[PDB]
Design an enzyme around this catalytic site. Structure first.
Site, PDB file in Angstrom:
ATOM      1  N   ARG A  85     -75.612  13.946  -5.480  1.00  0.00           N
ATOM      2  CA  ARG A  85     -76.642  14.835  -5.997  1.00  0.00           C
ATOM      3  C   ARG A  85     -77.438  14.122  -7.085  1.00  0.00           C
ATOM      4  NH1 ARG A  85     -75.944  17.377 -10.454  1.00  0.00           N
ATOM      5  NH2 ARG A  85     -73.660  17.380 -10.296  1.00  0.00           N
ATOM      6  N   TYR A 233     -77.258  14.923   1.407  1.00  0.00           N
ATOM      7  CA  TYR A 233     -75.949  14.888   0.775  1.00  0.00           C
ATOM      8  C   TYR A 233     -75.715  16.135  -0.071  1.00  0.00           C
ATOM      9  CZ  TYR A 233     -71.712  12.637  -0.857  1.00  0.00           C
ATOM     10  OH  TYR A 233     -70.396  12.315  -1.100  1.00  0.00           O
ATOM     11  N   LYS A 242     -75.388  24.556  -5.460  1.00  0.00           N
ATOM     12  CA  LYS A 242     -75.949  24.386  -6.796  1.00  0.00           C
ATOM     13  C   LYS A 242     -77.321  25.038  -6.915  1.00  0.00           C
ATOM     14  CE  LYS A 242     -72.415  21.940  -8.058  1.00  0.00           C
ATOM     15  NZ  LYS A 242     -71.394  22.552  -8.953  1.00  0.00           N
ATOM     16  N   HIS A 262     -70.756  27.752 -13.879  1.00  0.00           N
ATOM     17  CA  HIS A 262     -70.088  26.597 -13.275  1.00  0.00           C
ATOM     18  C   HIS A 262     -68.601  26.645 -13.630  1.00  0.00           C
ATOM     19  CE1 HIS A 262     -69.891  21.933 -12.726  1.00  0.00           C
ATOM     20  NE2 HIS A 262     -69.593  22.559 -11.601  1.00  0.00           N
ATOM     21  N   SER A 284     -68.358  18.121 -13.822  1.00  0.00           N
ATOM     22  CA  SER A 284     -67.889  17.488 -12.597  1.00  0.00           C
ATOM     23  C   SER A 284     -66.909  16.366 -12.912  1.00  0.00           C
ATOM     24  CB  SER A 284     -69.071  16.944 -11.794  1.00  0.00           C
ATOM     25  OG  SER A 284     -69.883  18.004 -11.324  1.00  0.00           O
ATOM     26  N   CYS A 286     -63.889  16.604 -13.931  1.00  0.00           N
ATOM     27  CA  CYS A 286     -63.095  16.892 -15.118  1.00  0.00           C
ATOM     28  C   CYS A 286     -61.914  17.818 -14.856  1.00  0.00           C
ATOM     29  CB  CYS A 286     -63.976  17.490 -16.224  1.00  0.00           C
ATOM     30  SG  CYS A 286     -65.188  16.330 -16.922  1.00  0.00           S
ATOM     31  N   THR A 289     -61.050  21.611  -9.768  1.00  0.00           N
ATOM     32  CA  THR A 289     -60.331  21.806  -8.512  1.00  0.00           C
ATOM     33  C   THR A 289     -58.829  21.612  -8.692  1.00  0.00           C
ATOM     34  OG1 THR A 289     -62.195  21.264  -7.069  1.00  0.00           O
ATOM     35  CG2 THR A 289     -59.974  20.880  -6.211  1.00  0.00           C
ATOM     36  N   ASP A 309     -65.449  26.245  -8.351  1.00  0.00           N
ATOM     37  CA  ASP A 309     -66.711  25.642  -8.761  1.00  0.00           C
ATOM     38  C   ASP A 309     -67.722  26.630  -9.330  1.00  0.00           C
ATOM     39  OD1 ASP A 309     -68.431  23.287  -8.942  1.00  0.00           O
ATOM     40  OD2 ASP A 309     -69.601  24.221  -7.333  1.00  0.00           O
ATOM     41  N   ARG A 403     -66.182  13.081  -0.310  1.00  0.00           N
ATOM     42  CA  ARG A 403     -65.922  14.511  -0.349  1.00  0.00           C
ATOM     43  C   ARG A 403     -65.121  14.961   0.861  1.00  0.00           C
ATOM     44  NH1 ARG A 403     -67.788  17.487  -5.092  1.00  0.00           N
ATOM     45  NH2 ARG A 403     -69.011  15.875  -6.162  1.00  0.00           N
TER      46      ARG A 403
END
Ligand SMILES: Nc1nc2c(ncn2[C@@H]2O[C@H](COP(=O)(O)OP(=O)(O)O)[C@@H](O)[C@H]2O)c(=O)[nH]1
Ligand SMILES: [Mn+2]
Ligand SMILES: [Mn+2]
Ligand SMILES: [Mn+2]
Length: 620
Positions: A85, A233, A242, A262, A284, A286, A289, A309, A403
């Site tokens: 992204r 992507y 997003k 987020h 992201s 961090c 998940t 997310d 991913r």
């Protein structure tokens, strides 16, 4: 009507009917068909039959490979130029720049990328006319959030990429049942093109259609439109994630009185049978998940995943903050996912999962850095660059942003209410990021206003999410820096206003740091499943347990308040140390940042918390 045959695209529809579409859906489809000039129009019904043919088609085109080792899993290899992204190509269009970003005092705004309507029209007309020549235009009707959910919103994505269709079928609710639910209702318009009209003028790399030079992801909240060009992507092409669920949604939430954040959502049950729902905003890479699917190490504790997310939250009639996961699957980073770190993810991605840019093993499996799993004798590895890969090379076999795209329903610990249209009550909110120094393992905010300040002051070291590199500590308030749909200052005031709601049950606000390091660069905290010990403390603090000590930065756990048994070898002193010298510097950077980046739109209560924190530190 028409005077010739250049406006009725019915003859090019290869699945569905333009007649069966709601009026405004047909106009949206046909208008862009006439602009993009696709060879075919495919109205997705979301069925298994359609999905299977789509996969077969992509397999015949060389777009994806079948991973024979697993059950209905597929591998896509992208152009190395279109592997993430792109934040610098992401813009928000409003008549007034101040609606999108606060007017910085000195420098350039980091809280968003604003583009005027006039400039976007020039960029748009320079990209989309004829961009789908010779390609199929897929019409994806999708719902963000469970169908019929009060916080659910419906979108229509037009795209010329079957990879996007397949991924959207996993990441959203997609199919005919969405059109029936939409009726003549409002919908978010999502237009996407890889920007490679046929015949091709630039040879395709890895059969991955993309146009890096002309890449542009645009948001027009006033018109409810998302327009994305050049990239196939993730965040650039799955427009519900997003672009829709965060940027567009955050603006709508501001208008309608809820929150688009987020944040992961997890439910945690303790040994006494009590269950609470928590939300956590990490940048992201961090640990969202890993936390949302954690396998807790404390006996009698159970973690369940609602989402990893995106959270849509709103106070209900009773004053509870209710959250839903608007997504339908998980789009998580592959590398670092192992049986010891995230075993629940491993169990989820073994079927009906699409992988992008991970390595393939000779026996039809997947491989990536950190998978922590030995390969059988004779098994060879093909890198994401479609080349023979040995561990002796410096090239990683899987791209750092590689991913998996997996259905949420397959998660073994998916919360039994992850699809409940009423949402789950949030009793605690967690902020955190990668801070190698200074920031202790966990502290609790002194109040709602201080909690809002804690989120606004969030900082984290550069990871591998956007196009940021090097070892730098940057600001990412609320983990939303790349995703703000509107003025961040107005975003703070919106958060602060929740304290004015009658009978509002404000959740507790915590800040965690899994990533503090000692003088040797070694992690002081083992993390992963051991984070259940930190959640236990938060759980007790929500119940009102007198387990907190007051410090200048907030409440920290009392001595022996953290369950540390089974560890003991943990340096507790350096893990919770609060240094005046470090925090004097921290307040100054937050001060300079908030002053420049939020300027005239900084709420006074946020400035007061900054002043109050500065005072408490000076008294150390
Ligand atoms: N040291 C440490 N690393 C973690 C922890 N949780 C996740 N990570 C690492 O952070 C990386 C990204 O984690 P992920 O869950 O995908 O982050 P997300 O993008 O916010 O969901 C992975 O490579 C993990 O190894 C933790 O508690 N401690
Ligand atoms: Mn994210
Ligand atoms: Mn993730
Ligand atoms: Mn107030």
């Amino acid at each position: 009507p028409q005077l010739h045959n250049g406006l009725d695209f019915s003859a090019k529809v290869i699945q569905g009917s333009l007649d069966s579409l709601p009026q405004e859906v047909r106009k949206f489809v046909e208008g862009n068909a006439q602009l993009c000039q696709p060879e075919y129009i495919h109205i997705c019904d979301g069925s298994e039959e359609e999905y299977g043919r789509l996969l077969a088609h992509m397999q015949e085109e060389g777009v994806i490979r079948k991973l024979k080792k697993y059950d209905n899993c597929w591998l896509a290899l992208t152009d190395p130029r279109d592997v993430a992204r792109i934040e610098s190509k992401t813009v928000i269009i409003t008549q007034e720049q101040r609606d999108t970003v606060p007017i910085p005092k000195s420098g350039q705004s980091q809280l968003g990328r604003w583009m005027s309507e006039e400039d976007f029209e020039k960029a748009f007309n320079a990209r989309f006319p004829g961009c789908m020549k010779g390609r199929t235009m897929y019409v994806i009707p999708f719902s963000m959030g469970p169908l019929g959910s009060p916080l659910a919103k419906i979108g229509i994505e037009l795209t010329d990429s079957p990879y996007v269709v397949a991924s959207m079928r996993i990441m959203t609710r997609m199919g005919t049942s969405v059109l029936e639910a939409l009726g003549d209702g409002e919908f978010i318009k999502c237009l996407h093109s890889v920007g490679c009209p046929l015949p091709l003028k630039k040879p395709l790399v890895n059969n991955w259609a993309c146009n890096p030079e002309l890449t542009l992801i645009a948001h027009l909240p006033d018109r409810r439109e998302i327009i994305s060009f050049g990239s196939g992507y993730g965040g650039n092409s799955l427009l519900g994630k997003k672009c829709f669920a965060l940027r567009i949604a955050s603006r709508l939430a501001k208008e309608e009185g809820w929150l688009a954040e987020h944040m992961l959502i997890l439910g945690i049950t303790n040994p006494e049978g009590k269950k609470k729902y928590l939300a956590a905003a990490f940048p992201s890479a961090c640990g969202k998940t890993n936390l949302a699917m954690m396998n807790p190490t404390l006996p009698g504790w159970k973690v369940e995943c609602v989402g990893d997310d995106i959270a849509w939250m709103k106070f209900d009639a009773q004053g509870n903050l209710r959250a839903i996961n608007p997504e339908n699957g998980f789009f998580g980073v592959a590398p670092g996912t192992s049986v010891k770190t995230n075993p629940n993810a491993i169990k989820t991605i073994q079927k009906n999962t699409i992988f992008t840019n991970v390595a393939e093993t000779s026996d039809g499996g997947v491989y990536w850095e950190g998978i922590d799993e030995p390969l059988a004798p004779g098994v060879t590895i093909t890198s994401w660059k479609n080349k023979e890969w040995r561990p002796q090379d410096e090239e990683p076999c899987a791209h750092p942003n590689s991913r998996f795209c997996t259905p949420a329903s397959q998660c073994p610990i998916i919360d039994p209410a992850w699809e409940s249209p009423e949402g789950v009550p949030i009793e605690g909110i967690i902020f955190g990021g990668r801070r190698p120094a200074g920031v202790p393992l966990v502290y609790e905010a002194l109040s709602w206003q201080h909690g809002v300040f804690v989120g606004a002051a969030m900082r984290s070291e550069a990871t591998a999410a956007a196009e940021h590199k090097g070892k730098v500590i940057m600001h990412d308030p609320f983990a939303m820096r790349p995703f703000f749909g509107y003025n961040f200052g107005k975003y703070l005031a919106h958060w602060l206003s929740m304290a004015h709601r009658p009978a509002a049950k404000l959740p507790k606000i915590f800040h965690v740091n899994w990533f503090r390091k000692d003088k040797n660069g070694k992690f002081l905290w083992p993390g992963f499943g051991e984070n259940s010990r930190v959640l236990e403390w938060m759980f007790g603090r929500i119940e009102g347990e007198d387990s907190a000590k007051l410090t200048p930065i907030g409440y920290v756990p009392k001595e022996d308040a953290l369950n540390l048994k089974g560890l003991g070898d943990v340096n507790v002193e350096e893990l919770f140390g609060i240094s005046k010298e470090f925090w004097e510097k921290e307040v100054e950077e937050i001060d300079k940042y908030l002053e420049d980046q939020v300027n005239a739109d900084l709420p006074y209560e946020i400035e007061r918390e900054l002043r109050a924190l500065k005072q408490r530190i000076s008294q150390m």
